[PDB]
Each structure stands twice: as structure tokens, then as C-alpha cells.
């Protein structure tokens with residue numbers, strides 16, 4: 345089992361070598377367009393880029409570049425789009441991307457302020473009277489309402505493509521106590537947030553891929569996605585013992601670099617998956633237990 349590997353990893357204290365090992369094995373593909381001079385100001389961090397092969401392209405003739413990747417998990421049959429926290433000049437591209445990609449949901453795993461710095465643009469309206477219009481890609485965004493919990497908030501947004509006046513509802517799931525380069529408070533509150541996004545319908549295959557981000561779109565987002573995929577995999581066979589977490593993280597880093605930033609986020613992934621396996625394996629009652637534990641209200 346993964347649970348045996350965990351104990352055994354923990355016992356000999358070797359998470360950091362395990363994680364280093366992954367870092368060494370991880371793929372490396374060109375990110376030439378990310379690196380073009382015209383895109384300098386479309387990238388939040390010098391060091392974090394989309395590979396060319398998996399990057400999301402805007403449907404615009406001017407400049408199709410956005411710091412975003414399609415993580416496409418073939419065996420699990422789920423995709424996500426991982427992106428960085430939008431910059432003040434690319435909140436229009438971010439919303440363009442969700443319109444074009446037909447996502448129903450965006451998962452935000454960070455605060456716009458962390459560790460004294462602005463980690464993300466305020467890319468969505470904070471109240472009903474004051475919608476956002478993104479004039480460059482001709483999109484309108486309105487808070488329809490939000491459901492505030494002690495550790496996360498869900499919002500309902502309306503996205504209008506101003507060019508045809510089509511309209512879509514986007515669910516925003518905002519985790520606000522997961523620290524940059526840290527980990528969720530516990531497996532239960534992580535699993536409860538994840539199942540909130542599952543229950544919501546946004547992950548379902550009748551929609552475009554969910555867009556998940558943190559500040560870089562790699563640490564916290566890779567953690568979130570790795571757990572979800574692992575649970576999905578376990579689900580379809582009902583066979584926990586044919587999931588290899590490290591191996592799934594490595595299929596993931598074929599599509600974007602740097603997925604999962606430290607060895608404890610790695611270790612939290614095992615925690616999250618081992619716990620969630622309870623629910624996957626037929627004990628649904630754990631779900632409401634995660635909710636009690638997580639103290640959502």
C-alpha cells in the first residue's frame with residue numbers, strides 16, 4: 345500500500361530525498377513563447393512558465409499568450425487548467441481563457457496578499473453594485489453572491505461575453521487559510537474544500553476543465569490536483585493499490601513544471617489521498633466527518 349510507503353518514508357525521515365527525487369525525474373520542455381520579449385509582462389515569475397506544448401492559447405490574433413497549462417490526465421479522464429495569479433494587465437486574458445475553455449469553476453488557493461506581498465490581482469468583483477468590465481477582451485464579470493465560511497468562500501459569478509451578450513455562471517471556490525509554500529490545516533478541511541468543489545458539478549466532464557490557481561499556479565495547485573486525481577483513479581477501479589502517487593505527480597509535471605513546491609506538500613498529498621480513500625472505498629459517512637472537523641461555519 346501507499347499507507348505502508350508513507351509510514352516507511354516517515355520512519356526513515358526521507359520525504360526530502362523522495363521529493364528531491366521527483367524534482368530530478370521531472371520533465372523539461374521548452375517554454376519559448378513564455379519567454380518571448382513581448383510576453384515579459386504577462387509572466388508573474390521569471391522562473392515559472394508554461395511549456396509550449398501544453399500552454400493554453402487565447403483565441404486572439406494579437407497575442408495568444410497566457411501563463412496557463414492544460415494538465416490532461418488521460419487515465420483518470422480529468423483535466424485541469426493550472427494558471428498563475430492573474431496580473432493587473434491579464435485579468436482580461438484570465439476571463440477570456442475561462443470563456444473560451446468553457447470552465448464552470450475556478451479554484452483559487454491563495455490570498456491576494458501573502459507574506460507582505462501582492463500575490464495575485466483582485467480579478468473578480470467583491471460586490472454586486474460594482475461589476476468588472478474587461479475592455480480588452482470585451483467580457484463582463486458580476487458577483488451574484490457568495491457563501492462565506494471560516495476558511496473558504498464560494499462565489500457565484502456571472503460572466504458575460506459582451507460581444508454576443510451570452511452569459512455563463514462561474515463558481516469561484518476560494519481557499520483563504522492555505523499558506524504560500526505551506527499546507528492545509530488538516531486533511532479534513534482540505535478534503536471538505538475539495539468535495540465542496542466536486543459536489544458543485546464543476547469537475548464534471550460536461551464542462552471545460554476547471555481552472556485552478558494559486559500565486560504561481562504550481563505549489564498549492566499541484567497539491568490540490570494531485571490529491572483529486574489520485575482519488576479519481578482509486579474511484580474508477582475501486583483499487584487503491586494500483587495508484588502510484590509519485591508516478592501521478594510525475595505524469596502531471598509533463599504538462600506544467602514545479603507541481604508541488606515542497607516535500608511536506610508532498611507528504612500532505614499522501615495524507616489527503618489515504619484519508620479520502622475511506623470515502624472512495626464506500627464509507628461515505630466520513631464526508632460529513634470532514635465537515636465537522638473542518639469547522640466550516
Ligand SMILES: O=C(O)C(=O)Nc1sc2c(c1C(=O)O)CCO[C@H]2COC1=NS(=O)(=O)c2ccccc21
Pocket residue numbers: 389391392393454463524525558559560561562563564565601602603605
Ligand atoms: O502560490 C503557490 O502556492 C506557489 O507555488 N508559489 C510560488 S512557486 C515559486 C514562487 C512562488 C511564490 O508565490 O512566491 C516564486 C517563484 O519561484 C517558484 C519556485 O521556484 C521555481 N518553480 S519551478 O519549478 O517553476 C522553477 C524552475 C526553475 C527555477 C525556479 C523554479
